[PDB]
Amino acid sequence: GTFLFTSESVGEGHPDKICDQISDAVLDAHLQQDPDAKVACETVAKTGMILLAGEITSRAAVDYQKVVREAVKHIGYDDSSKGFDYKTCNVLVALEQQSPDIAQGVHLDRNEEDIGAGDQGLMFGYATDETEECMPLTIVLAHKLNAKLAELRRNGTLPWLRPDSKTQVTVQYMQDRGAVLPIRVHTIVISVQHDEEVCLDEMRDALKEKVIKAVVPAKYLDEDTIYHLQPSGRFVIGGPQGDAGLTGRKIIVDTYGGWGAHGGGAFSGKDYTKVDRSAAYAARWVAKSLVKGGLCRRVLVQVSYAIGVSHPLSISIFHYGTSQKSERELLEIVKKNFDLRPGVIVRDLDLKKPIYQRTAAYGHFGRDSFPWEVPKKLKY
Amino acid sequence: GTFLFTSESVGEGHPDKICDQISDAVLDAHLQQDPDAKVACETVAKTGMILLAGEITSRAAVDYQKVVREAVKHIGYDDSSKGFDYKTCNVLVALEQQSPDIAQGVHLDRNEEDIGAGDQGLMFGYATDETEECMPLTIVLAHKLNAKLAELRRNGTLPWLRPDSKTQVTVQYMQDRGAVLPIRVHTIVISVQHDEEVCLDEMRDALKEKVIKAVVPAKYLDEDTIYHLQPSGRFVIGGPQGDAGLTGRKIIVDTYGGWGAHGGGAFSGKDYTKVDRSAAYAARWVAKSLVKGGLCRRVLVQVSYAIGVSHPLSISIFHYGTSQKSERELLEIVKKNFDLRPGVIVRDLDLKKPIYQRTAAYGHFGRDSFPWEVPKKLKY
Numbered sequence: 159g160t161f162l163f164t165s166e167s168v169g170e171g172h173p174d175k176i177c178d179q180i181s182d183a184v185l186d187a188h189l190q191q192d193p194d195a196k197v198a199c200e201t202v203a204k205t206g207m208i209l210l211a212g213e214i215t216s217r218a219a220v221d222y223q224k225v226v227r228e229a230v231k232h233i234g235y236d237d238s239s240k241g242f243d244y245k246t247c248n249v250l251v252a253l254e255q256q257s258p259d260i261a262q263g264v265h266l267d268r269n270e271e272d273i274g275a276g277d278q279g280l281m282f283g284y285a286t287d288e289t290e291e292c293m294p295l296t297i298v299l300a301h302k303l304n305a306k307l308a309e310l311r312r313n314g315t316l317p318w319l320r321p322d323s324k325t326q327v328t329v330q331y332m333q334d335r336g337a338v339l340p341i342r343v344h345t346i347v348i349s350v351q352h353d354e355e356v357c358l359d360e361m362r363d364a365l366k367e368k369v370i371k372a373v374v375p376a377k378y379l380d381e382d383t384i385y386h387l388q389p390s391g392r393f394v395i396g397g398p399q400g401d402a403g404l405t406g407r408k409i410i411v412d413t414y415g416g417w418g419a420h421g422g423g424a425f426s427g428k429d430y431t432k433v434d435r436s437a438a439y440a441a442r443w444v445a446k447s448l449v450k451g452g453l454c455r456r457v458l459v460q461v462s463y464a465i466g467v468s469h470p471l472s473i474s475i476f477h478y479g480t481s482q483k484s485e486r487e488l489l490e491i492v493k494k495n496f497d498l499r500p501g502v503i504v505r506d507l508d509l510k511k512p513i514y515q516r517t518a519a520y521g522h523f524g525r526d527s528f529p530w531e532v533p534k535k536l537k538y
Numbered sequence: 539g540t541f542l543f544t545s546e547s548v549g550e551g552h553p554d555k556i557c558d559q560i561s562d563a564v565l566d567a568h569l570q571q572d573p574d575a576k577v578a579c580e581t582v583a584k585t586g587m588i589l590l591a592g593e594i595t596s597r598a599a600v601d602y603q604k605v606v607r608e609a610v611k612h613i614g615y616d617d618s619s620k621g622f623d624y625k626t627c628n629v630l631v632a633l634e635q636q637s638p639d640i641a642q643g644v645h646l647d648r649n650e651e652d653i654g655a656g657d658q659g660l661m662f663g664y665a666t667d668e669t670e671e672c673m674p675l676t677i678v679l680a681h682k683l684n685a686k687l688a689e690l691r692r693n694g695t696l697p698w699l700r701p702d703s704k705t706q707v708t709v710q711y712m713q714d715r716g717a718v719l720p721i722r723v724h725t726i727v728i729s730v731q732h733d734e735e736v737c738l739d740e741m742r743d744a745l746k747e748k749v750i751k752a753v754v755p756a757k758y759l760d761e762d763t764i765y766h767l768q769p770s771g772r773f774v775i776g777g778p779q780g781d782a783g784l785t786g787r788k789i790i791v792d793t794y795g796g797w798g799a800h801g802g803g804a805f806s807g808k809d810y811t812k813v814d815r816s817a818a819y820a821a822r823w824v825a826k827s828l829v830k831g832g833l834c835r836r837v838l839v840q841v842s843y844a845i846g847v848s849h850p851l852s853i854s855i856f857h858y859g860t861s862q863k864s865e866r867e868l869l870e871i872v873k874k875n876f877d878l879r880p881g882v883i884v885r886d887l888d889l890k891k892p893i894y895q896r897t898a899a900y901g902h903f904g905r906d907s908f909p910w911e912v913p914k915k916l917k918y
């Protein structure tokens with residue numbers, strides 16, 4: 159009855175994640191001045207370049223050069239020896255106003271509660287009781303391994319570390335009446351960019367002793383656990399120099415690590431009218447509310463929208479057999495407790511607040527008691 | 539016991555899909571001259587611009603301006619009245635060689651069968667017996683609605699159509715011992731870019747009569763079916779002018795429309811050593827082989843890799859309760875029948891062949907008897 163499952167995460171300096179953080183730094187800069195800014199900011203990163211491309215209609219006066227460079231500085235790319243430098247990189251801007259055809263069909267002359275979805279699409283929310291934060295253990299451990307690397311880099315413990323990293327965790331689970339129970343860690347992968355001076359054996363020993371052992375409980379690790387530490391053997395070239403990054407290329411890292419489902423929409427660089435983000439956050443909120451409310455142990459929620467229409471086109475619930483209530487009954491509880499119009503979600507989840515850059519690394523879910531992580535008390 | 543499920547698709551002129559097709563046109567151009575080209579081509583599209591960013595090491599001599607412009611011409615953006623023109627757009631190239639650190643860790647001095655995975659990651663394959671092509675009905679119908687729009691545009695039936703479109707289909711299903719049975723179409727959305735002269739009522743009537751009725755069997759449509767046709771009310775501005783596109787931003791449209799699972803990796807612009815593509819194609823091949831082989835009615839396959847390591851780190855099978863065999867037994871059949879090393883998948887699926895641009899619109903699965911769509915006869 160056991161099986162393996164794998165999830166990955168990436169560090170703050172992974173080039174796709176750099177793009178997500180810059181896109182959300184731009185969004186936050188606009189929201190600080192104009193809470194009703196319409197933002198759809200994509201970022202591309204390659205050797206020496208940050209390009210912003212997209213559509214913004216806002217009353218804010220934003221200094222893109224400063225916002226971009228400050229986000230790159232925060233990540234840690236501050237010298238050409240690291241392959242990228244916020245002080246000296248090229249920042250190119252190809253931003254236009256939001257299409258007037260979209261604006262007229264979505265929000266112009268609309269009451270805020272009755273604003274239309276900013277696009278069509280489908281979105282999922284997921285929650286599992288296998289961890290207190292209601293997230294899959296595989297993804298939680300993968301994120302914590304990247305956060306540990308960043309901590310040891312920033313505190314000077316492992317000064318050879320650079321910001322670009324990837325991790326991957328394979329857990330052996332037991333099936334339990336639809337719920338899943340973690341047994342042990344089967345395999346861990348860590349790849350991290352490093353300086354030219356450190357040797358492979360020093361890195362592998364540090365990754366095991368100072369990173370894995372500092373994150374993964376010893377009860378999950380045994381003589382059979384497989385470790386792939388710096389498996390490529392050399393990772394000096396990294397960040398955008400090693401691989402082009404784009405916003406919205408880590409959507410599974412951002413969500414549930416392969417568990418649940420995904421509707422395809424990226425989160426970063428988008429204001430609340432883009433249901434790709436707001437409805438995915440609301441769906442997580444619903445799923446977590448169902449699990450923390452004791453209605454099920456594991457649950458998947460789907461919602462969908464049409465551009466210009468406020469109410470969802472569909473809502474579906476899948477409880478994996480982990481509820482005594484039928485899926486039809488859970489759907490009725492959801493419909494009685496939640497209003498998934500984007501103009502209502504914005505109020506419930508305070509989505510005009512400029513906290514988005516905080517979401518753009520280490521996953522959008524299962525952390526920091528964001529509004530979508532605080533369960534709603536259900537009435538039924 | 540019924541539920542709703544929604545999937546979407548996009549047209550050839552949707553800006554993200556333009557990027558996927560250009561990335562795969564570049565890949566195919568290199569493979570035509572150098573079957574061992576190492577390609578990681580990302581494309582960005584915004585008003586008047588195609589930018590190529592990424593890493594290519596190849597012996598081919600490729601004219602990027604010609605390859606890009608020919609792909610845009612094929613899509614149909616050939617005049618400034620349509621918002622984009624292959625003849626006059628800007629084509630910018632920011633392509634470098636593949637990182638030597640990656641090359642040495644993945645393929646340099648390696649026997650082809652024993653080449654390492656080009657990155658870490660997780661990938662899923664999925665198959666369902668609900669259609670002959672073993673794909674979810676929601677996604678099949680959504681893709682066919684975009685293909686119909688392109689057909690009617692190209693044959694001059696609806697000369698007001700432009701290349702950028704999106705569709706979305708909600709189906710009401712019945713649960714059947716883990717398998718799913720389509721009952722009826724609950725909701726359809728169609729949004730398509732159009733000329734300045736056609737009125738909304740003419741478009742809505744044509745979308746219902748000439749598009750939906752030409753694609754969706756009447757048995758699925760009834761008096762209760764909801765139609766959202768041109769729901770924004772106006773879609774003259776479109777293509778990259780309306781919304782920035784990027785490669786690998788339609789990964790759910792490319793795969794299973796929300797069904798199954800996704801590991802996060804994009805397909806387009808990558809050669810076979812990038813397991814994001816080759817292992818996802820092999821996982822589809824495994825899943826389809828299990829369903830067509832009569833071992834299950836519905837199945838999800840996960841595989842994962844570490845950069846530089848040839849064999850998968852994990853393989854998992856989930857049959858939704860649709861097999862008499864346990865998941866452990868199906869996993870043993872898979873392990874006896876398939877070799878999921880990338881240097882073996884390349885041979886089985888003929889992945890050096892330049893057919894990739896054909897995959898980059900209307901989904902990578904369930905069409906045209908590509909090698910990953912031809913089931914393997916299983917021995918057990």
Ligand SMILES: C[S@@+](CC[C@H](N)C(=O)[O-])C[C@H]1O[C@@H](n2cnc3c(N)ncnc32)[C@H](O)[C@@H]1O
Nearest residue numbers: 172349390392393400401578593636639640657
């Ligand atoms: C391996 S690269 C992707 C493939 C690459 N575009 C190519 O040209 O082959 C993907 C991610 O892996 C990481 N990476 C880059 N260079 C690496 C190296 N030498 N060893 C391990 N991981 C590396 C970085 O996080 C990078 O964004």
Ligand SMILES: C[S@@+](CC[C@H](N)C(=O)[O-])C[C@H]1O[C@@H](n2cnc3c(N)ncnc32)[C@H](O)[C@@H]1O
Nearest residue numbers: 198213256259260277552729770772773780781
């Ligand atoms: C609605 S746009 C995304 C949001 C946009 N970036 C913004 O600035 O609000 C996403 C996709 O919807 C389609 N689209 C663009 N303009 C549209 C319109 N006026 N009505 C309906 N769909 C539209 C195109 O396929 C486009 O790529």
Ligand SMILES: COc1nc(-c2ccccc2)c2cc(Cl)ccc2n1
Nearest residue numbers: 161333416417418799840854855856
């Ligand atoms: C026990 O639940 C469960 N769920 C899944 C699952 C994961 C993601 C999306 C949908 C289902 C699963 C997947 C594999 Cl490959 C193997 C065993 C599994 N067991």
Ligand SMILES: COc1nc(-c2ccccc2)c2cc(Cl)ccc2n1
Nearest residue numbers: 419460474475476541713796797798
């Ligand atoms: C009967 O199978 C099934 N599967 C799913 C499912 C879809 C994608 C990924 C994993 C599971 C499902 C999802 C919803 Cl929201 C509602 C009912 C459902 N029924």
